[PDB]
Amino acid sequence: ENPKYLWWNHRIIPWEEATVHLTDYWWASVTAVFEVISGYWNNAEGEMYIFRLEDHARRLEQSMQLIRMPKEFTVDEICQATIDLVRANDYRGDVFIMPLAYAVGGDRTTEMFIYSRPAVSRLEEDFSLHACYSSWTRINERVLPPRIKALANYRNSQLASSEAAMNGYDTALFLNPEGKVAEGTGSCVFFVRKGKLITPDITSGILESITRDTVIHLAREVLGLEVEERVVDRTETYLADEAFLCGTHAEITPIASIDRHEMKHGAPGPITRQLRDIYREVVYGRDFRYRNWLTPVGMGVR
Amino acid sequence: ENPKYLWWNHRIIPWEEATVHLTDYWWASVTAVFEVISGYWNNAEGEMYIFRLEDHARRLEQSMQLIRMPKEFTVDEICQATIDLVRANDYRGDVFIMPLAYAVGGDRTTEMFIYSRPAVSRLEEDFSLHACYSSWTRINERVLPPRIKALANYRNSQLASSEAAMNGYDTALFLNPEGKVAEGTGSCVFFVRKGKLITPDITSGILESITRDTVIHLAREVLGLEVEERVVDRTETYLADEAFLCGTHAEITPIASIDRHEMKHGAPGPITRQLRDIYREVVYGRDFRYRNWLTPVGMGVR
Amino acid sequence: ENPKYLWWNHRIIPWEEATVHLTDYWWASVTAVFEVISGYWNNAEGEMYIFRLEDHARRLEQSMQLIRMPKEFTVDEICQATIDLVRANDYRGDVFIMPLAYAVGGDRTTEMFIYSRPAVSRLEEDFSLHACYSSWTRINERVLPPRIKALANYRNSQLASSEAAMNGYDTALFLNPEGKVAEGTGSCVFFVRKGKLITPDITSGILESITRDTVIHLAREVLGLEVEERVVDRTETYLADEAFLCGTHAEITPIASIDRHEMKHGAPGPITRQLRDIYREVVYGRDFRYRNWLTPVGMGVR
Amino acid sequence: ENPKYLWWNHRIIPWEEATVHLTDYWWASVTAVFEVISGYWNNAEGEMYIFRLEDHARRLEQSMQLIRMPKEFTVDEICQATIDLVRANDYRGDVFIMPLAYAVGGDRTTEMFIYSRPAVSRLEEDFSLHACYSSWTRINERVLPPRIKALANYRNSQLASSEAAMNGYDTALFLNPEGKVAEGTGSCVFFVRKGKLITPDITSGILESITRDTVIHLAREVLGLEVEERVVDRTETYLADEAFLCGTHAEITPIASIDRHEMKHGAPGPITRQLRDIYREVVYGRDFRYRNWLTPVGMGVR
Amino acid sequence: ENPKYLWWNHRIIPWEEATVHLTDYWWASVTAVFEVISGYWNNAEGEMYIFRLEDHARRLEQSMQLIRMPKEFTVDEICQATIDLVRANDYRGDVFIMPLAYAVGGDRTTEMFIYSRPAVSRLEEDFSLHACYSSWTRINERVLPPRIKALANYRNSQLASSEAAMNGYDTALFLNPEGKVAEGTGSCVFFVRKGKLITPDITSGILESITRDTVIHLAREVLGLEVEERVVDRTETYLADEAFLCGTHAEITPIASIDRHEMKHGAPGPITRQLRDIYREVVYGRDFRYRNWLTPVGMGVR
Amino acid sequence: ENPKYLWWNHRIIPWEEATVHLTDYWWASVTAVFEVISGYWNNAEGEMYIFRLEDHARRLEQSMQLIRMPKEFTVDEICQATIDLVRANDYRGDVFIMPLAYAVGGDRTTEMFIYSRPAVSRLEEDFSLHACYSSWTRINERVLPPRIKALANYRNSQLASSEAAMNGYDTALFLNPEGKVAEGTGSCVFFVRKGKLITPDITSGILESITRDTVIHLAREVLGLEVEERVVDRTETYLADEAFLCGTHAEITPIASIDRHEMKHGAPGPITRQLRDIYREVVYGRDFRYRNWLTPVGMGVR
Ligand SMILES: *Cc1c(COP(=O)(O)O)cnc(C)c1O
Ligand SMILES: *Cc1c(COP(=O)(O)O)cnc(C)c1O
Ligand SMILES: *Cc1c(COP(=O)(O)O)cnc(C)c1O
Ligand SMILES: *Cc1c(COP(=O)(O)O)cnc(C)c1O
Ligand SMILES: *Cc1c(COP(=O)(O)O)cnc(C)c1O
Ligand SMILES: *Cc1c(COP(=O)(O)O)cnc(C)c1O
Ligand code: NA
Ligand code: NA
Ligand code: NA
Ligand code: NA
Ligand code: NA
Ligand code: NA
């Protein structure tokens, strides 16, 4: 069942009006940048909570500025479009909102659509992925800034992901050109060793993850954990007590193993279970301390 | 004015029937590979000549195999689709045919369309581009095989191309991760110094260019020129007597200068003028020696 | 109008006595190291203030030790030579003092001259440079230690600087062999984002800048600013609220833009305006807190 | 005893008139490029033979073009200046001629001098050097094109040369950034293994040596030797039957050993002895086959 | 059943006399170099044929010279030791002979043993391996010369080999630090595409394989095949018509696939079947053209 | 005089029973990992103190897990084996204990021996080494994780060590692939500049040194010193006030110089003398603050 609506170039339109030609936009897709924004439905409150909407909208405006898309949309327009579309679609459950900006062909024009679709959350569930390091190297600033969340950056993140599946793993992790740990294919990665949390620093060649930012805040401020952002080596992650992938799509995804070295305290391990549960209570609006991360959209009870 | 038809998933359909949803295929575009195939119209013969159709169709099948698209189309189907579409569209002039293959979401499905549109040839004309080397590095086998003609590989080739335009040049050339000359943004590059032709070897990190292959054949076999495929240094190209970009879209594009070092014998220089003219007579079907490169489509005089 | 004097090999001599043969010292210039030392004239006090003379003289002795020039001069001799020459020249305005050490040809001999010339300060003025990243890579420890302030290190810093001018920019910034931000051509670079100050760490492959050291002190101790010395990525600097070049010659030079991405809070931006003004009051001897950085030379009012 | 004359900026002048200020030209020396040209005195013929004068003069014009020195001198002017100065100096023995071009400070001016001094030839003598590989890496196209014979490129070639002397060797050889054999500090290197001659290819990151060019011609055309220009590994050179350094200053310099691995057939080994003797007979004008490499300057018997 | 004898430090001794302490030689094993030499038993002739004994013995002396083991053994001693041991052991079938040299601890002493054990040949059999590229990078000249056949070089070649087995492949192939194809874990690799044979050049960072040398000779001289020794890219090998591993242990080992891309003409493919059969007839002494590669040891019929 | 006993595969046995065949274990030695554990004899207390036994035993279990040796031994077994062997050998002086684990050949078996031998301590003595940087590059995570204390990792650490000796130095220091300071050949390195202690961070590509860990603790907690773990450049170490190598074998080894640049405050310098003396009092059991690092083995007075 399609959403009722989507937003396209400054306006909400019924889903079925947004038809284009098969041959529109394949060249535009080379330039395209996107965000993935979560909405979490609190049936008790009859409110959707859109997680860090403004951070996502600012990350998009920056990705657009680095692609050098001419100015057409604002942060406030993308935030309001997302609010308006989640209300108008009238779906009272968890959603993914996806803004996607693209430049169409000298005088390129900037366009964008936003669509919101139902999403499955796994923050109640206890599951684990078996990860491998890819024989494929992560994109770097020299060739393809990981900082831009460009569709093209995912060509790199399907060399790794299809390798991982055909060799019997659930997920790929990347090494950077210099042999250091980069990120997952769609997400940042965390390692627990002791109860010290470890994650690659930004200049390891990764996206400016809002989830990574969120986890680091929650780990330091709720749990009092030490969190190291640093150059991380492959072999030390094999020795991790726990590991997880985090991102908007990934929420908190435990890693059971890495190149078949098994995380000592399981998956989800204790620090992972804690961070997963705190995350969940934040995003569903049952933690008043983190309220400023949440954009409510009142829609009335399901 | 749109073409009458296009080919999509094993069938020709009127142009206007190929409508999809705005939100179809943005994830598929990450995987997408394409060819650009030239058709040259000989009004004297009333035939379109499709240049090296089978090489293009085989390059596409290989690009698809390296992306790991499941098998759905054959070389012979792509060659025949292109013949059939150029006839059915009933346009008696120069065309670009563009097959584009993409995988749609475990059990991914392989899809492809082909569309043929009128094209402007510049093989009569004498023009020249001012080129710069980009401060952006070419994609390599470690991160994004240049060998695959993937839409995503063009994200790299618009870092360079937009830099080139905003800094007052017509076109970008690339250096590889190791500092050696790679290719243009959409084309291979040739240098003339003496009347020795020079072009980067394939493992410099370039596409397996059919035009590059064609030029090397024509330079050796018609002109008796020495042609070096080797590691090429930046500074020596500044000292080139001539330079040109070559590809299907680019045909033979003379470079007047490179980072404002001007090619000594102009643009097009003498060896460039020769190769341009021989190319033109080959592709338009007025050189019986190269006939096996040509797929005629008889359509009757314009 | 030439200075009255200069210092050469342990002695002050009239300017016109320091004549050599056209063919002396071109081989010596390969080895040569130098400092640029500022003197700031306070007409109210009738004193020249020589900025961080001993740091400059120690940096020179170290540059000499790393070149492996045999010992001939001392730190104290270079400090006193600079004091004596600024007095003897009897010029009551802002000056640049330039010690230059060189080895002359087994048993190489160490020589040095120091000359002081009038200098224009721009610390009253509000101006801005448009910067590009160079397609040329910074020298590293593997080939040419950036730590040594050798004339030869400037061959690298005129690949970048002449590129920048011919492509319509005022100044070049460098990327290191690994693609990270290095420095300007003659100066260290600072970025303001938030009001967090950011500058590459030393092992990014930069000179041990006294101005950079000075700015970091002034930013932390006068302004209470956070200052990050770290690996800095190209794309984040495009997103900078402000940027500036700093060095002895450069003082504080605001950057309006970088590869045509414009710094959000202008040039000079607010944190830049503050640091410029504090710097100025320090170097001119109107800030008693920083007095230990200043070597007064009393000469009587202009 | 000084030469009678030198050439400076389009004119011959007595040696003693070419006096400048100690402080002229230290910044210009960063830009400076030079050639070293040999003159060989044949007392039997009363002629100096200037070796490959035009190649040297063209290499200089190219080095100048790559530095981007504005045009001021011609190839023919440098060739004639060198002829005229060797006649006017009236020294009837072996000489080194050294053109040195430099740009003086927006609107930079191009200047050049040429001076000719007596030189000791070692082509009668049988001597050998003990070489080490340097822990310092050769300059590459990314940072400092080895192709430009710039004074600054010798800062790199005194990291290696002073290391070599203090660790008990006569001479340094370089490895490139990728770990492959580059060149000596002032010369190209040849290895003999079998009686196959081996030397790094140009894009190993070396100067376009006229001596290297000369040796390769003489090895192929007089001796019928196989000569490989290719990527050369460190360890294989340890296993060389012979090795030598060649250049204008170096003529043919045998290497007895490399990191204390001794060349099997000694120094000079047999192929080295042959090439040394053929070189000598070429440069002294007693080999009519190579006459086109020689510019005679008749001056009458010593 | 143990061999009757082995050779150790210049003498043949019964197998059971060669007992040492558990704690002897673990430090020596860091330095150790070895060869693997094949003996092929021709029961018709009652002769063992030892394949390219002198090449193997010279490769060992070179490996020893590069490790800097003091001189103790000669090429002729290793050749004769191997002859004598294969006779004295009195085993009339295919054997592996393994010389292993090691330095024991200032004044290190050089030691060596040689032992010959029965070996299974697979040159009658038609079998195939499924290969992966390793996420582990091959050792290079910078860190560990692949040219030395050192036991330590196999630590690298069990990162790859254990990865390959746990991820469901039969064998690992390596990429070099620069992302190009290096070798297998114990063998060189060949690709057939067309009927052009392709194999990495030596400076791709590989061992000087005698089998690789043998195959290239046999391919050119018996089959008239084109054989390219060059930089080889990962993706092109996926497109290979055939592939094989070759070495002393490996003989000719067909590769059915590489990262699950299947070689078009199977395994063994036609050119592979030919080269396998020619190899077999060479090593068993039924090809008089290649007799100079064979060291017969007459022992009388089995 | 041999020890009375050693431990092998879960049991203590007389020294003379541990005899194997010359040809056992040369392939196993490729996989082998080891620790070096110090025992310090306090004749006053009649106790051996085994330094950080559990850290060493855990480092071994991790090295074994990363090699992928099947589980056979425990941490507690290695700790108890070492205690038991030092008692049973009945030697009342300083010892080195060396566990060495190895896998013997599909279904590899894990084996280990431990042997304890008398050791000379140099912690009373004042001596100094002259160090060079090696022209050989340190092993990295890409090829050979420095994190694993594998015998094979020492092949790299005898390229450097034999270079150092033949070029007149006492010891080699390494640069990493990126040109930064790695470690010594068998030890971590510390630099003193000011009285700030500096040592490369782990991801510089070094072993997880227990001695390095110990020194950093003692420097911070006893001396209140600042200790920087960071990327360290070659040239800054030349400017060090002091330097030392530290490890189990090396204890605290002062460096007098580095590529003949002499440490300003001598060797051992003051901070080095302090750390040496504190280390000594810790390991000999005369510092109750560090008692938890010590495993006593009471044996009665010598
Ligand atoms: C989006 C993304 C992430 C996670 O970022 P969030 O802002 O938390 O969604 C990680 N890696 C890649 C490659 C991404 O594109
Ligand atoms: C297609 C392409 C070329 C030229 O190849 P042709 O087969 O001659 O069209 C060159 N460079 C790039 C990046 C390409 O994609
Ligand atoms: C001198 C210099 C600087 C600035 O250092 P100061 O001590 O502040 O003058 C920056 N970059 C380079 C390349 C320099 O030579
Ligand atoms: C000049 C030079 C050579 C040799 O070139 P010739 O033209 O034969 O003198 C080799 N190496 C370097 C670095 C040089 O500058
Ligand atoms: C020995 C070896 C080979 C093959 O060499 P042969 O002389 O043919 O046995 C290939 N790779 C490695 C790593 C080797 O050690
Ligand atoms: C063991 C070792 C060290 C020092 O580690 P400790 O645990 O202090 O003995 C340093 N470098 C290397 C290469 C080592 O193997
Ligand atoms: Na609203
Ligand atoms: Na047809
Ligand atoms: Na004074
Ligand atoms: Na004349
Ligand atoms: Na015999
Ligand atoms: Na006990």
Author numbering:
A (entry chain A), B (entry chain A), C (entry chain A), D (entry chain A), E (entry chain A), F (entry chain A): 6 to 110, 118 to 314
What text does the study give?
Transaminases (TAs; aminotransferases; EC 2.6.1.) are pyridoxal-5’-phosphate (PLP)-dependent enzymes that catalyze the reversible stereoselective transfer of an amino group from an amino substrate to a keto acid or ketone, thereby producing a chiral amine or amino acid and a new keto compound. TaTT is distinguished by an expanded substrate specificity: it can catalyze the amino group transfer between BCAAs and α-ketoglutarate, producing α-keto acids and L-glutamate (benchmark reactions for BCATs), and between R-PEA and α-ketoglutarate producing ketone and L-glutamate (R-TA-like activity). The functional dimer of TaTT is close to the dimers of known BCATs; however, the P-pocket comprises only one site for the α-COOH group binding, and the O-pocket is enriched with hydrophobic residues, which disturb the alternation of hydrophobic and hydrophilic residues typical of BCATs. Generally, the active site is a combination of two pockets: the O-pocket on the phenolic side of the PLP and the P-pocket on the phosphate group side of the PLP.
The mP3O1 variant, harboring a triple mutation in the P-pocket and the mutation S115R in the O-pocket loop, showed the highest affinity to R-PEA. The variant mP3O1 showed the highest specificity for R-PEA: three mutations in the P-pocket together with a mutation S115R in the O-pocket loop improved the productive binding of R-PEA as well as the effectiveness of the amino group transfer. It is noteworthy that the achieved effect was not a sum of the effects induced by the separate mutations in the P-pocket (mP1 + mP2) and O-pocket (mO1); rather, it was the cumulative effect of the four mutations (G41V + Y101F + R43S + S115R). Mutation R43S in both variants led to a shift of the β-turn and the interdomain loop toward the active site: about 0.6 Å between the corresponding Cα atoms of H261 and V132. Substitution of a side chain of R43 induced the flexibility of the H261 side chain in both variants, which is reflected by the high B-factor (mP3) or even the absence of the electron density for the side chain (mP3O1). There are large conformation changes in the O-pocket loop in the mP3 and mP3O1 variants; moreover, in mP3O1, this loop is partially disordered (residues 113–117 have no clear electron density). The S115R mutation in the O-pocket loop induced its disordering and increased the W32* side chain flexibility. In mP3O1 (mP3 + S115R), W32* has two conformations: one is similar to that in mP3, and the other is unique and occupies the WT position of the O-pocket loop main chain. As an imitation of the R-TAs’ pyruvate-binding site, the introduction of S115R in mP3 was unsuccessful: the productive binding of pyruvate in the proD-position (through the coordination of the α-COOH group with the side chain of R115 in the O-pocket loop) was not achieved. The HPLC analysis of the products of transamination between R-PEA and pyruvate catalyzed by mP3O1 revealed only L-alanine.
